[PDB]
């Protein structure tokens, strides 16, 4: 998929944000912005431009699940790719995230190799 694509990395922890950010750089994706919760995320999303969301699951204010749901209910943002990040591959989550239209799923901690999979998977499902 196109390299100039604009990412939004959403996580309450800045280290996780910086990890994901650098992993994306490694795979040749340099256009990344950050947010610390769902509300922060939504606020930046409404500036337009973004083509992919990587979101943490557990966040005060508005967790990733609520965020994803808001994106899907949003007329302009409904189709946006959203990869959900979680600390546990709990069956219930994977379902929850599926129900809500999560494009993909990943457990932290995760390697660059692992991220390349998930992104590519997403890209081939949607035609990016």
């Amino acid at each position: 998929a196109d390299k100039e694509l604009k990412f939004l990395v959403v996580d309450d922890f800045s280290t996780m944000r910086r990890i994901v950010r650098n992993l994306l750089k490694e795979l040749g994706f340099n256009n990344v912005e950050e947010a610390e919760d769902g509300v922060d995320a939504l606020n930046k999303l409404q500036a337009g431009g973004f083509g992919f969301i990587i979101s943490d699951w557990n966040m005060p204010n508005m967790d990733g699940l609520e965020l994803l749901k808001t994106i899907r209910a949003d007329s302009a943002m409904s189709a946006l790719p959203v990869l959900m990040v979680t600390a546990e591959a709990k069956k219930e989550n994977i379902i929850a995230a599926a129900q809500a239209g999560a494009s993909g799923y990943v457990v932290k901690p995760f390697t660059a190799a692992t991220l390349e999979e998930k992104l590519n998977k997403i890209f081939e499902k949607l035609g990016m």
Binding site: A89, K91, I94, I95, A98, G104, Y105, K121, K125
Partner: peptide, 8 residues
């Protein structure tokens, strides 16, 4: 079994 079926 779940992850796969879902395209995850």
């Amino acid at each position: 079994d779940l992850l796969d079926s879902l395209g995850f």
